[PDB]
């Protein structure tokens, strides 16, 4: 019933409500053959990221269940996922207008976690590195996460 209700209006509380099941209930519910839909879930889930043990663990657990499903789909263009992700974070241009999210901390932390996971195609790393650089305004507001993420990509 919920899970969907979470996605409509993500909150740390709602997410912690779903149980350890939340990871897979989210991942199964999103059409993981479609990069735009996967980006949507990704940001939604990562939007409730908080420095808080239980919430942090939950957010990363969703991301993983989701992304592992994505990267495991033969219909899933990971390149289009990255492009659409950065477009949505307001780090890349696009022909279509987008809601351009306002806070990147969560998103940036989720990425920091994602890139480091076995499931992640290492080939995509250098690509992502080149758009975490370019002196964008919304990034210099999260120096840490940006810097934390850059360090990961070098090493992975």
């Amino acid at each position: 019933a919920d899970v969907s209700t979470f996605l409509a209006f993500p909150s740390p509380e709602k997410l912690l409500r779903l149980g350890p099941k939340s990871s897979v209930l989210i991942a199964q519910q999103t059409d993981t053959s479609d990069p735009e839909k996967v980006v949507s879930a990704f940001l939604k889930v990562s939007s409730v990221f908080k420095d808080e043990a239980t919430v942090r663990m939950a957010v990363q657990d969703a991301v993983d269940a989701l992304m592992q499903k994505a990267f495991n789909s033969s219909s899933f263009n990971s390149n289009t996922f990255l492009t659409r992700l950065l477009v949505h974070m307001g780090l890349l241009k696009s022909e279509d207008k987008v809601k351009a999210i306002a806070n990147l901390y969560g998103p940036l932390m989720a990425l920091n976690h994602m890139v480091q996971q076995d499931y992640f195609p290492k080939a995509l790393a250098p690509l992502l590195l080149a758009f975490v650089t370019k002196p964008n305004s919304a990034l210099e507001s999260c120096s840490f996460a940006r810097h934390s993420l850059l360090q990961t990509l070098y090493k992975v």
Partner: protein, 76 residues
């Protein structure tokens, strides 16, 4: 001699610079005081881009007024 250096995210910092001496070393010891490198910030006095040579004298700087600091801008 008494100036205010204000960033976009509203963070004042007072300097004790000399009437005649170049603003280069102020700029230098601001970026070395707030973390970032030189070519990431630009220093404006009421609009005017402050270069290394600029004397507090060669613009009508008073013993209070504000130097603004701005981001590097990038767009494609």
């Amino acid at each position: 001699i008494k100036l205010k250096v204000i960033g976009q995210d509203s963070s004042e910092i007072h300097f004790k610079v000399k009437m005649t001496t170049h603003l280069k070393k102020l700029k230098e010891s601001y970026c070395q005081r707030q973390g970032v490198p030189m070519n990431s910030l630009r220093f404006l006095f009421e609009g005017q881009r402050i270069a290394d040579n600029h004397t507090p004298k060669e613009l009508g700087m008073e013993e209070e007024d504000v130097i603004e600091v701005y981001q590097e801008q990038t767009g494609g």
